[PDB]
Amino acid sequence: ADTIVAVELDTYPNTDIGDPSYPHIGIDIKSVRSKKTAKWNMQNGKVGTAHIIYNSVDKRLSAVVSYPNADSATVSYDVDLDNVLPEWVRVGLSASTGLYKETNTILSWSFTSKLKSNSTHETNALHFMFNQFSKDQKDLILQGDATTGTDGNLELTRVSSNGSPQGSSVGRALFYAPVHIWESSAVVASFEATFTFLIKSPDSHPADGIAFFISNIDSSIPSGSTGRLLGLFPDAN
Ligand SMILES: N[C@@H](CCCC[NH3+])C(=O)O
Ligand SMILES: [Ca+2]
Ligand SMILES: [Mn+2]
């Protein structure tokens, strides 16, 4: 019942649900079966950076994911998000572990949304930036196992004191304020997101991934959306 648009950093290849046979980045429109993917040379224990951009003129959602000293991966999909998402949405980060696992640590997260009308000098805009997350983060909605304040970080999935990730975990953080991605007099609407992330696993096979998403405002973690479903989807349709 939730409507989900997402960019996925999928760390575990579930080839039965259309994943390529490698860690990849994907654009997901209302399904975990990415409309478009690109190989991603994920680096266990390194701080990666994800960038997501879109506008209403190009109607192209794109993402680039990089680490220091490495080539980047990029993926794009032509989609009019005004025909997918409602006029008001929330934006968030989601992550999961299954029988395979990893830390899903967010060190920073920023977002900008702009609606520009045909009115002279009439931009509407939201921008937030989190470089340091705190124990009691009132401008975030945390769902599932997501916690804030450990080392100034957002831990999307469960991690023990000692610092090792737990399997079968799922968590999300959504920005408190609803975001307006369309208005009747808009001539261009754009958003961008950036997050930095540290995926570390004691295992050779980490799972399952991190996603930036945009949903209906009332979105919650669907049942059984641990593991391959990334805390985003009720199933693999
Ligand atoms: N209180 C919930 C969600 C509502 C946010 C209110 N500041 C949380 O733990 O994130
Ligand atoms: Ca997967
Ligand atoms: Mn995938």
19 is in an annotated binding site: yes
20, 41 contact by CB (below 8 A): no
192 is in an annotated binding site: no
Q: Ligand 1 centroid to 138 CA: how many Å?
A: 6
Closest to 160 in 3D by CA, of 213, 208, 101: 101
Q: How far is CA 4 from CA 28, 94, 206, in A?
A: 8, 11, 24
144, 231 contact by CB (below 8 A): yes
- Name the closest ligand to CA 100: 2
**1-237 CATH choice from 2.40.170.20, 2.102.10.10, 2.60.120.200, 3.10.180.10:** 2.60.120.200
The span from the CA of 4 to the CA of 164, in Å, is 30
Q: Ligand 2 centroid to 182 CA: how many Å?
A: 31
- Name the closest ligand to CA 32: 3
Considering only CA atoms, which residue is closest to atom 5 of ligand 1?
141
The span from the CA of 145 to the CA of 158, in Å, is 6
Which atom in ligand 1 lies closest to the alpha carbon of residue 139? Answer: 7
Closest to 206 in 3D by CA, of 47, 72, 42: 42
Residue 36 bridge partners (DSSP) = 27
For residue 39, the 8-state DSSP code is E
Structural tokens at position 156: 């999307």
Residue 129 bridge partners (DSSP) = 110
From start to end of 59-104, where are the E strands? 60-66, 73-78, 88-96
Specify the 3-state DSSP secondary structure of 16.
helix
Helices (H) and strands (E) in the chain, counts: 0, 16
228, 11 contact by CB (below 8 A): no
The span from the CA of 159 to the CA of 16, in Å, is 28
Specify the 3-state DSSP secondary structure of 172.
strand
Q: How far is CA 178 from CA 47, 73, 137, 140, in A?
A: 29, 30, 16, 11
210, 23 contact by CB (below 8 A): no
H-helix or E-strand spanning residue 149 = strand 147-150
Which atom in ligand 1 lies closest to the alpha carbon of residue 138? Answer: 7
Place of tokens 């570390």: 200
Considering only CA atoms, which residue is closest to atom 3 of ligand 1?
141
The span from the CA of 174 to the CA of 192, in Å, is 15
Q: Ligand 3 centroid to 21 CA: how many Å?
A: 10
The span from the CA of 12 to the CA of 209, in Å, is 7
Ligand 1: list residues with CB < 6 Å: 138, 140-142, 176
The span from the CA of 5 to the CA of 27, in Å, is 8
Place of tokens 């079968």: 168
Instruction: Calculate ∠ Cα 138-139-141, nearest 5°.
Output: 80
31, 233 contact by CB (below 8 A): yes
The span from the CA of 125 to the CA of 187, in Å, is 14
* CB burial readout 53-75, b (16+ within 10 A) else e: bbebeeeebbbbbeeeeeebbeb
Considering only CA atoms, which residue is closest to atom 7 of ligand 1?
138
93 is in an annotated binding site: no
* Domain-wise residue ranges, the chain: 1-237
The span from the CA of 11 to the CA of 229, in Å, is 12
Residue of 139, 140, 145 to mutate, ligand 1, most atoms within 8 A of C-beta: 140
213, 84 contact by CB (below 8 A): no
* CB burial readout 189-219, b (16+ within 10 A) else e: bbbbbbbbbbbbbeeeebbbbbbbbbbbeeb
